[PDB]
Amino acid sequence: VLRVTHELQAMKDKIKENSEKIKVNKTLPYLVSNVIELLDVCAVIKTSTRQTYFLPVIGLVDAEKLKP
Amino acid sequence: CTKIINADSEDPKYIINVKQFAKFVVDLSDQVAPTDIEEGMRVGVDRN
Amino acid sequence: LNAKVRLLREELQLLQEQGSYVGEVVRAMDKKKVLVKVHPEGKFVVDVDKN
Amino acid sequence: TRPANHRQLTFEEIAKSAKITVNEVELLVMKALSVGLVKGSIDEVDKRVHMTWVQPRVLDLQQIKGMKDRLEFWCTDVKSMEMLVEHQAHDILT
Amino acid sequence: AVQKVVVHPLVLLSVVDHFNRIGKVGNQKRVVGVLLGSWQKKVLDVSNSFAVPFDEDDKDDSVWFLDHDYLENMYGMFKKVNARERIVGWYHTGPKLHKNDIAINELMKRYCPNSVLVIIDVKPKDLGLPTEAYISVEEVHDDGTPTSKTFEHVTSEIGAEEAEEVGVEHLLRDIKDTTVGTLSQRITNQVHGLKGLNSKLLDIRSYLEKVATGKLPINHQIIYQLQDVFNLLPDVSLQEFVKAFYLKTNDQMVVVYLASLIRSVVALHNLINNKIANRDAEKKEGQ
Amino acid sequence: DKDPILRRSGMYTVAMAYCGSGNNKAIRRLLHVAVSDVNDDVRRAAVESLGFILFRTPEQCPSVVSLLSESYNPHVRYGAAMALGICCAGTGNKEAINLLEPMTNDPVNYVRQGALIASALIMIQQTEITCPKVNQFRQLYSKVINDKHDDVMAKFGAILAQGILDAGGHNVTISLQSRTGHTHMPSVVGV
Amino acid sequence: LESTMVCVDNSEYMRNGDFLPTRLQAQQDAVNIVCHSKTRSNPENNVGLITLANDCEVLTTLTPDTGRILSKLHTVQPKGKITFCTGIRVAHLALKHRQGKNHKMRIIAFVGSPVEDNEKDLVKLAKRLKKEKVNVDIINFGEEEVNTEKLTAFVNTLNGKDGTGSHLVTVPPGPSLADALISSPILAG
Amino acid sequence: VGEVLKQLTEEKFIVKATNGPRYVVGCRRQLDKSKLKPGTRVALDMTTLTIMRYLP
Amino acid sequence: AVDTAEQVYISSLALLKMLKHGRAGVPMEVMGLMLGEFVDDYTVRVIDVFAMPQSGTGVSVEAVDPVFQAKMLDMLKQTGRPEMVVGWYHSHPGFGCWLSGVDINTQQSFEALSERAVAVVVDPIQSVKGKVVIDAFRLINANMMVLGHEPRQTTSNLGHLNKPSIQALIHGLNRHYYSITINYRKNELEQKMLLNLHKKSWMEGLTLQDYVVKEMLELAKNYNKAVEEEDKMTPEQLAIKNVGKRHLEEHVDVLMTSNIVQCLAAMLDTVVFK
Amino acid sequence: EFLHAQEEVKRIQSIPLVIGQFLEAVDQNTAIVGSTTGSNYYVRILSTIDRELLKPNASVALHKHSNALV
Secondary structure, three states: OHHHHHHHHHHHHHHHHHHHHHHHOOOHHHOEOEEEEEOOOOEEEEEOOOEEEEEOOOOOOOHHHOOO | OEEOOOOOOOOOOEOOEOOOOOEOOEOOOOOOOOOOOOOOOEEOOOOO | OHHHHHHHHHHHHHHHOOOEEOEEEEEEEOOOEEEEEEOOOOEEEEEOOOO | OOOOHHHOOOHHHHHHHOOOOHHHHHHHHHHHHHOOOOOOOOEOOOOEOOOOOOOOOOOOOOOHHHOOOOOOHHHHHHHHHHHHHHHHHHHHHO | OOOOEEEOHHHHHHHHHHHHHHOOOOOOOOOOEEEEEEOOOOOEEEEEEEEOOOOOOOOOOOOOOOOHHHHHHHHHHHHHHOOOOEEEEEEEOOOOOOOOHHHHHHHHHHHOOOOEEEEEOOOOOOOOOOEEEEEEEOOOOOOOOOOOOEEEEEOOEEOOOOOOHHHOHHHOOOOOOOOOOOOHHHHHHHHHHHHHHHHHHHHHHHHHHHHHOOOOOOOOHHHHHHHHHHOOOOOOOOOOOOOOOOOHHHHHHHHHHHHHHHHHHHHHHHHHHHHHHHHHOOOOOOO | OOOHHHHHHHHHHHHHHOOOOOOHHHHHHHHHHHHHOOOHHHHHHHHHHHHHHOOOOOOHHHHHHHHHHOOOOHHHHHHHHHHHHHHHOOOOOOOHHHHHHHHOOOOOHHHHHHHHHHHHHHHOOOOOOOOOOHHHHHHHHHHHOOOOOOOHHHHHHHHHHHHHHOOHHHHOOOOOEOOOOOEOHHHHHHO | OEEEEEEEOOEHHHHOOOOOOOHHHHHHHHHHHHHHHHHHHOOOOEEEEEEOEOOOOEOOOOEOOHHHHHHHHOOOOOEOOEOHHHHHHHHHHHHHHOOOOOOEEEEEEEEOOOOOOOHHHHHHHHHHHHHOOOOEOOEEOOOOOOOOOHHHHHHHHHOOOOOOOOOOEOOOOOOOOHHHHHHHHHHOO | OEEEEEOOOOOEEEEEEOOOOEEEEEEOOOOOOOOOOOOOEEEEOOOOOEEEEEOO | OOOOOOEEEEOHHHHHHHHHHHHHOHHHOOEEEEEEEEOOOOEEEEEEEEOOOOOOOOOOHHHOOHHHHHHHHHHHHHOOOOOOOOOEEEEOOOOOOOOOHHHHHHHHHHHHHOOOOOEEEEOOOOOOOOOOOOEEEOEOOOOOOOOOOOOOOOHHHHHHHHOOOOOHHHHHOOOOEOOOEEEEOOOOHHHHHHHHHHHHHHOOOOOOOOOOOOOOHHHHHHHHHHHHHHHOHHHHHHHHOOOOOOOOOOOOHHHHHHHHHHHHOHHHHHHHOO | OHHHHHHHHHHHOOOOEEEEEEEEEEEOOEEEEEEOOOOEEEEOEOOOOOHHHHOOOOOEEEEOOOOOEO
8 A cells, every 4th residue: 555655755756846847948048059968977068158068967857868 | 029939839838039149948928818929020028 | 563564454455346347438428428338348328427 | 022222132032032042043033033024123233123113912911011111101201391391481372 | 984074064053053952951961963964985074964852861871762754854855955965874962972872873774874973062172073973883803892892983074165264263363373383382292291191091090990990901902002003112211212323313413403504594684684674774863 | 251242341340440540450451451352342442441540640641542543443543532532531632632633534434423522522611722723623523514425424423523512602511520639420420 | 632652562472473363463453443543533643653672662753644553563573572661661751752742642552572570660660650640551462471460450550540540451362353352442541 | 168278286277168268277176187188178167166077 | 113223143053054055056046044033123133044945936935835934943843942034045146245126025025924024145255254245135115215214323333334335236226225234143152162173173283193394394494595595685785775865575484483393393302202 | 463464365366266368557556457258357456466577468367256466
């Protein structure tokens, strides 16, 4: 019976994370741009403001489908 | 002033870019009818 | 003497204030106003001090 | 057992400690000190040890070397020097 | 493991603040709380911590409580505001480590596989640090000690941050070389001749205290092994250090000779310079 | 006591107990406190006390206050000005005003009102012939209550300075010592 | 409003599974039904418990939810001998430390091993609890102090004294059915 | 992201972000200056301008 | 019904928490609420502060989570003594300290909730022990502007308040605002503990290993001797010059101290040991 | 206190700076310097810095907030 408790727990961390995750896009400095490249212990992003940033955290979404 | 370059179903999620700074994924303002928002024409967005 | 030295060191505190920009005065009009063009950004109109 | 002074021990000391002749003391001290576990000094003019460092075992009895014999009592000298310097320099000490 | 432990000042401030907060009743004599940190390396780096409710009863030092619900809730809140943080151990006051500690540590062992205990002192006297870090371990001793189990001490330090000494140190600070060799040497000799003397005489009493109260005069190889390495030097008789004659004497003599030569040079130069700043400048009658 | 304000209370108690005497122990303790104590308020209270306890010998007060006149701490200078004003009472040493004048131009507004009040207290009852400088400060007072760019808090002392200088229709007077030598408790309490 | 701290047993004696399929299961369903009754009485009543097996560490707090009670009730692994005095003192300190001190106080005990013969110690320990007017009932399942009767007077010494009175249930001989064991605690505290 | 324009000192070095501005920064804990010869990609935090993970 | 030159006491724990939290999320413009305490209109104190959770909204009023604050307050009541939330702090990394429209709206909301709702502004602009860029602001309603802004009844404290004066950007947005005097809360036990911390931890005062010292000293003294020998030319010329209507070099206190300490090390060398 | 002031002044320049090109000198303790961002600022120079080295264009680091020559 503890199984449903964990799965009901899932309607817990996801809701808060979604709210924050759905702000960067909306926010003006989003600077949606092209990822310069990918690495491993990570992302390298050329923001649409012509700036190259290095992100240690490759990103919230899993890195497998981050095509250079 | 900004130029719209795309739109998406469900949440509109426009990909408008203002002049040349950067593409912004911005939702429509609360007080606008969704019909007016379209693709490839001038519109107005506030900074914050 | 060394109170004076301390006072001078204290007055070196003015370094905290950020420096002023540099702009070539395109044209100065009456009524204490001048239009100037700072290098980084386009021109504008400013009011003059009393010095 | 005994550092400094008697730490320097005549070859005959090693002879007695190794039931070997005095000349055998001279001939054998090499291998005897060979060991490969204790590093230090030894003075083959008289085979005087005054060795630097060793790996000692338990200390006999209630740590004879532990009390004033070697340690502790020197704390008195340390305190004496400390008080002397303190009194001498009190003015600058502030 | 956990060779070094570094405690940020925030931790000490929080601990003392909570101690004063609970000061309403002094019966506790302890501040048991959950202490958080990071494994930046094999060295732990402590950070923000907090105090959870507890009890330290003298009745066999076995009435102890760490509300699991409160612990979990505080954990969650802290992680939500600081993901990088996570539990690293627990801390308590009452410098004399109450015998309950072992049991409590076991609880922490569950929350963290290697949870360290840090004992902090509300009132610092001198030397060392108000903190003391202990880790609970279990093993079988080579010597033959039954259960070979006891808390092991682990070194400690203090952390670093930005713009904190302004809170206090602005009131007083003497960062300079005027006291170097004026006060530094004095405090050094004082601390040595006090603490080292105290430890040595404590062991002196212990030589028979091992029989009366302490463990055993021939006990804990670390004890007498460390004593022997201390007496790596004879400490008596020739001592083979300051009686080395041509080895130590001559070295000290050359060093002091050079130091005194430069001393004379600086003295002469100071004399001339101060004379010129003198009469040359002071002998102005000005009619 | 650890509390700075308790230390200020102690300094005031020292002043009041040793009122009208040159007890060297009191002067030494007070000067050491003023030199050392970090809390500027304690230093200011200490220098005020110093001014208080040495009024029977005004000639010497300016000598000690002189060094305080030029210090890094504005509060030290302000308290020094007040101490000079209280010590000299109403008699014009001709050096009190001499030191105040340059002190009457300090950048800090706090010092500004301190100097104004001190000068007003000193010059009370005086005359042009008796003190040639009385006019200047008078005029000075007017200007500081006339210019607008001056700090309002700075000018706040100027009006009181005028009032004190001309207080009571040029009849009332401040004096802590009775003609018979008995010290005037009311004057001490008021100051 | 009631808050309870129970003292279950998990000992090598509890390693036996005699009562019903497992004496441990007998304790489990007893605790389950008493918790259900408590919840029915008042939804915010708090339940917690610990095992007195070689230790009396509170298994967790006094939460006002049954699901936690049953979930934790699992994972017993009975290997440690009982320690009644430590268990009861820990339960008392939990009750006092409980934020909801207004909640009515109670303590249960699912002991299943021989207890300390000395009755003076227990009498002294629990007559103080009586002075601070605490309610405690003790339940014995399995191989306990054989059909304890000396505790009966002690029961009046801790709960009762021409007052409330908390019944004590020893181990019935042979197999014991849960329902019979639990008809008593509900019938009398 | 920026490049190590030059090794001003064993403690501080001159670097330039891709955006163009040039600053002087320093190793954080151990950035292995032996391998950070003039010209070495490094990412700096935009709160203290400190040298972090280096990747060519 | 009248303002004055009031004061806010900040506990050392409070300022340390504020600065560390600010430095934690400098790019994100973090924010939070304090747990302050009332004593009188003239003075108000703050002891504890918690971090409201990161939110993409920013410093918006909605960023306050009632369940989070309720839970934190309940827990604190359980352990230790909490106090009602005085106001909010945030880090404005742009330049110094000031406020914006959203900030004033939030402050107005809190002022509706309570009396002071003091606002706190911090920034990454910091010095090792010489910035304390923190500041405290409070808004003024536009209804009583006919009445005096801040009725003052004390010269010393008003002048001390003015001594900080107002910042460039502060005047740029000083209106609807009036900064309130801040001061570090009295600190003795914490002060003493920190003072003990410095000697052994924040600077080299272990006092047992406190005493190169004979290896590189020769070389340092060589450098300084050569340098002083060189510098001796300038005083030579200066003296050579006549009345005519860079001799000051010092460089001697350093040698004095260094080599006198080295010589004193003989005290350790010959007595303290052996 | 004098020593404290001296060490504070020395520290003033230790904080990470921003490179840039000095343009020219107006008067002692003041000058005009151009940053790598291209803007030209009117700033001050500490008494410690020594003139002949300042006079040539060369390169110089500025305080990231005060922009003062260091």
